[model samples]
Target: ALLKPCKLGDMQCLSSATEQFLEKTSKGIPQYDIWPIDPLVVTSLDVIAPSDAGIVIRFKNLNITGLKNQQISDFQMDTKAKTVLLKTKADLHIVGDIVIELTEQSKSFTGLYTADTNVIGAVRYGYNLKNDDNGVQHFEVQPETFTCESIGEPKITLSSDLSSALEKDSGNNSLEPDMEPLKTLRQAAICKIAEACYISVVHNIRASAKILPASSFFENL
Candidate 1:
């Protein structure tokens, strides 16, 4: 077998083995699901910088693809803490539409958006033990989904398309004035959408999770 038993408390050996296993199995966000994450709905992105902007945005529907190319780069096993720390890097392409409503005024806008973001982040996986019928120890791993830990600033290319009719009709005969507000709003909205995408990834990961055996990570020394 490519995998072998590691000595007790040999965290280095165990960590490497576990990372290898994860790299093999964790390539897809939900290995069994459809290629793209469909119907990823963010009902309200009213969670970010509410005080900065008097606006509310809600995603009607979104789809995330390219999770199949995910790469797990690091895994650290902490025997004392009983947890494994790791980071996954991937390129996620998200396409969606949102309703942006102005709270201070009555103006409402809807736009279609596409964000191709390169995501790199950390997650922690936990483990516990239970004794079998014969008093043999078994392991129970509590795997975690990816979160935006932000090793570096995430690279996001966002394009939000709102019609010229809406822009032109709203107290503006020229294009320059309309561009500024929408630009700032787009900047704020992109981060929120990325946040939602990470959440959706976590949900799908938990849904498809399987209970892994102890041997998947370790064995008798």
Candidate 2:
């Protein structure tokens, strides 16, 4: 097969070619060093907060996983504008510990806890064409244009330490019962964190913006 340039006017050809480019670049290209989103290291974080001042939540080792499994599912190209609109699906898994401390008027409890859940959502990306120093063409992705939203709930799997502590102190086994209120808050938190990490991944891909030569795109066209 010979390498063929996109017909510029044919939407299907442009879309198909763009899909090939995505597949090629997504193979952990060393030249670009993009694809297979990297692991995240968040030492500590205090997500927004509960209105109740007596309760406090802290997160440690906010290790996020399942990014490398990110895959592009659909592609839409605008031949005239030279822009690509793609959708990606990923399992934004969170593995980390949290601390829930309470200081009541006559009671207080403090211990280490963790929330385990995988946030899955479809993220949208819009990339525009540009030229490199050597006349090679590249696609530039803007972080602000990347769009994502929570698609489902955050299933909380508390750690033994936290579970035991929660059951012993609050006479409740599940975080839903112990706290009984911050369920949606925790879900919101996980979604926000996952979104941020996805953005960072996009930022990295933007850094490795240059596409390979024509042949690399169409078998060295």
Check candidate 2 and list the clashing pairs: 98-113, 215-220, 215-221
**Displacement of the residue 107 alpha carbon in candidate 1, Å:** 2.0
All candidates' lDDT scores?
Answer: 0.53, 0.54
Q: For candidate 1, write residues 52-170 as lDDT tens digits.
A: 46656656666666454556666677777877665666676666675656667777677665656666756666766666676655565575644565423333332333656445556
Q: For candidate 2, write residues 1-221 as lDDT tens digits.
A: 11235543455664555444444443345655654344565567665444566665567776666555555555565645655554555665566766655656344333444344544444455666667788887667655454454435455566566566656765665555335325534654565666666665665556555454433332211
For candidate 2, the C-alpha RMSD (Å) to the true structure equals: 6.1
Give TM-scores for every candidate, taking all chains together and pairing residue i with residue i.
0.60, 0.60
Clashing pairs in 1: none
lDDT of 1 at 196: 64
lDDT of 1 at 194: 55
Lowest lDDT sum, 10 consecutive residues, model 2, at 212-221
| Candidate number achieving the greatest lDDT relative to the actual structure | 2
